[PDB]
Structure formats: structure tokens, C-alpha cells
């Protein structure tokens, strides 16, 4: 149940213990590189909930991206930028999923969970050999992660008529003139 | 209503007979694979939603759990013997429950089962 | 287009693809359906000869006069 205790603790973010840990940890990340290998998940409950397993093949990389805006607003998220940069550095791995770990005033810190598609453990284990399949190359670059789905608007209902099933696809379908043989 | 570029977004259906032939060949491919079996699954009878169309019935997605139970067909066996199952639908009425159990009884009366291996 | 011109100009042969299909179009084997299936007939006609129902849904059109396969 320790993961449930950590879930409640992580929901209590501005509490004294979590605030102290986030401060001293933000200083560490600022002393380290902008993108670096994290030996272990800093938030194990979040990692395991997002799909991190303690196998050979699951890697965690931490990244800091500058926050703010370009008054122009970027349509994708800082999560998407961090995921794309981590994937480009680890071009041989598949980006499984990322999560916020620390904010700071000038940067923003995300840990990205990645899977090795070429490792034998990953290849033999189901539940991950789907990411071994070649249709999942650079999901972070194509918007196939959680932040990509959120930004593209993959929800069902009246509030997502234009954006579900692909915005450009829907626009093209609505703007095609269909002419049949017997008109 | 041509303020946009319909010329680069225009589509013609010159392959209507070609797609008809392709779909017919696909139905024969299914019946070559599932040769003694029907090429579809048994679908329930459902009343249309709104006041405009509530006087008529159509075919639904799948049969409900308790109407399968009343018909006497086990849950884990129905999709195997060729009955669509819908866990989202609720009967909410003895009329729909009775209509669908009668349909499943008719399927039972007209079905032939082969004994495993 | 350039690749097609290059192929038509070169002496290398044309790799003619045989008409293979992913899915077979007729039942096969040593079973009753396989031995009684007529490949020059249609699905509905074969099932009408067999005495079996091929479609369990609503008729989407007019059937043949002797069709007994579309419930």
C-alpha cells in the first residue's frame, strides 16, 4: 500500500515535507545537466501507474525545459517538448510516457519513461511487444503519448466534434465534393 | 459555394462496381473461412430512441447479460457460438427482455453444435 | 515516372507479380462443405442448396426467388 501512501503524499504538494524535497531536488537538477539519465524513478508510484516496470529495458531520463511562451502560444505542451528532446537523445528507445516531477520558476522538470524495443526481455514479454512493433516509432514526435492525445483533443462527445478522429482529416472530409455516377 | 479549392478536393466514385465486387468477394472469403457458420453474428432487437422513431425496432449491438441468462446461454460461450454480447445495454423493461429471450430461444432451436474436436 | 522510364529503358526483366490473395475464396479440405461447395455458384446459392442460413441480419435488398439463406 506504500504506493497509495505516496499517491496521497504527491497529491499534497505544497505540504511542508513535499515542498522541502522539491526545493532541494530542484537545486540538484539545476546543478546537473539539462537532460540526464535518472537511475531510478523519483516518483515510483507515478512511474508504475504510468507503466514503468523494473525490468532490463525500462529507462528513466529527466529533462528540464524553459517555461513560458514564445504573446504567441505554442499549441503543444512542455511535456511534448521534453519527450521529443529525450527521444532524440535516445533515438533507439521508444518513449512510453512522461510525468511532471518539479516546476521551478524558469524551467520545468519532467521524467520520461522509455522502453528498449531491441532488448530480449521486452521482445519476449507481451504488454510491451506492441511497442516493439514498428508502427510506434517516435510516438512523442507524432503526438501519440498522453500529452499528444490531450493536445490533439481525442475525446468523444459534442465538445470535440471538430478535433476527434483527426482535425485535418475531418476538415478534408467535410470539404470534399463527392460526385457519384448517377447524379 | 466554391470559395475554397474543391478542384483539389473533389472525389469521383468510378469504382462503385469494383468496390461492390470486392465486398462480395470479402463476404465469400469469410464464408470460405467460416464455411458451415453464418457470416455474421445474432444481433438483438432494440427500440429506436427518439419520439420520431420509437414506433419501430432495429438490430442492436449485442445481447444483454441477464437476457442471455434467461435464454440459458452462458456468457463465455455466447460469442463462441456466434452471439454478439453488449455489456453496456440495460433492458429496463420486461418487453425488451422477453423479445430478446424469444429471439435467443429461436436461435437455440435452429442451431447445430459440433462436439469440440 | 522517372523510375518507370528507367525500367522501360533498361534490359532488366519485369518482375511480374502472380495474382496471390491473402484470403481464399472457396472452402477447402476433406469436409462435407468443402466437397459439396460449388465454386461457380455464389454464397447464397451454395447455402440454399446446403439448407443453411448465411446472414442472420435484416435483408438489405431483394433476394433471388429461390433464396433461402437470408433470414
Amino acid at each position: 500500500g506504500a504506493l497509495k501512501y505516496l499517491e496521497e503524499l504527491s497529491k499534497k504538494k505544497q505540504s511542508d515535507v513535499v515542498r522541502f524535497l522539491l526545493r532541494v531536488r530542484c537545486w540538484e537538477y539545476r546543478q546537473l545537466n539539462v537532460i540526464h539519465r535518472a537511475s531510478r524513478p523519483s516518483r515510483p508510484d507515478k512511474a508504475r501507474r504510468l507503466g514503468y516496470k523494473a525490468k532490463q529495458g525500462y529507462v528513466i531520463y529527466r529533462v528540464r525545459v524553459r517555461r513560458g511562451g514564445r504573446q504567441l502560444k505554442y499549441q503543444r505542451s512542455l511535456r511534448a517538448t521534453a519527450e521529443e528532446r529525450v527521444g532524440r537523445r535516445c533515438s533507439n528507445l521508444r518513449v512510453l510516457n512522461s510525468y511532471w516531477v518539479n516546476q521551478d520558476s524558469t524551467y520545468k522538470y519532467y521524467e520520461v519513461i522509455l522502453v528498449d524495443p531491441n532488448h530480449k526481455a521486452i521482445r519476449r514479454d507481451p504488454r510491451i511487444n506492441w511497442i516493439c512493433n514498428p508502427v510506434h516509432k517516435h510516438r512523442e514526435c507524432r503526438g501519440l503519448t498522453s500529452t499528444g492525445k490531450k493536445s490533439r483533443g481525442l475525446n468523444k462527445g459534442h465538445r470535440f466534434n471538430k478535433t476527434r478522429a483527426g482535425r485535418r482529416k475531418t476538415w478534408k472530409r467535410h470539404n470534399t465534393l463527392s460526385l457519384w455516377r448517377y447524379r | 459555394h466554391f470559395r475554397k479549392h474543391w478542384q483539389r478536393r473533389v472525389r469521383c466514385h468510378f469504382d462503385q462496381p469494383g468496390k461492390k465486387v470486392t465486398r462480395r468477394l470479402a463476404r465469400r472469403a469469410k464464408a470460405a473461412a467460416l464455411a458451415p457458420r453464418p457470416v455474421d453474428k445474432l444481433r438483438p432487437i432494440v427500440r429506436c430512441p427518439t419520439v420520431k422513431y420509437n414506433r419501430r425496432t432495429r438490430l442492436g449491438r449485442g445481447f444483454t447479460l441477464e437476457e442471455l441468462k434467461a435464454a440459458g446461454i452462458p456468457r463465455l460461450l455466447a460469442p463462441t457460438i456466434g452471439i454478439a454480447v453488449d455489456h453496456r445495454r440495460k433492458n429496463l423493461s420486461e418487453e425488451s427482455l422477453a423479445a430478446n429471450v424469444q429471439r435467443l430461444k429461436d436461435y437455440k432451436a435452429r442451431l447445430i453444435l459440433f462436439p469440440r474436436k | 515516372r522517372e523510375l518507370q522510364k528507367r525500367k522501360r529503358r533498361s534490359s532488366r526483366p519485369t518482375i511480374r507479380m502472380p495474382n496471390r490473395r491473402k484470403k481464399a475464396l472457396n472452402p477447402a479440405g476433406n469436409n462435407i462443405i468443402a466437397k459439396s461447395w460449388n465454386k461457380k455458384e455464389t454464397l447464397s446459392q451454395n447455402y440454399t442448396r446446403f439448407g443453411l442460413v448465411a446472414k442472420l441480419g435484416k435483408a438489405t435488398g431483394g433476394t433471388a426467388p429461390g433464396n433461402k439463406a437470408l433470414l
Binding site: - | P36, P38, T80, I81, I112, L113 | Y47, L52, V53, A69
Partner: peptide, 21 residues
């Protein structure tokens, strides 16, 4: 394939059947 899927297929595999006209 997973063991649970293997068990489900072992104990409930697609059956051979036909519907009378």
C-alpha cells in the same frame, strides 16, 4: 501470448456450428 488468454482460449475456443434454414 499471456497465460490468462491461453487459459481462456483453452477452455472457450471458437466452436463449429451451423444454423438451419
Amino acid at each position: 501470448v499471456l497465460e490468462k488468454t491461453k487459459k481462456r482460449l483453452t477452455h472457450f475456443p471458437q466452436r463449429k456450428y451451423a444454423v438451419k434454414a
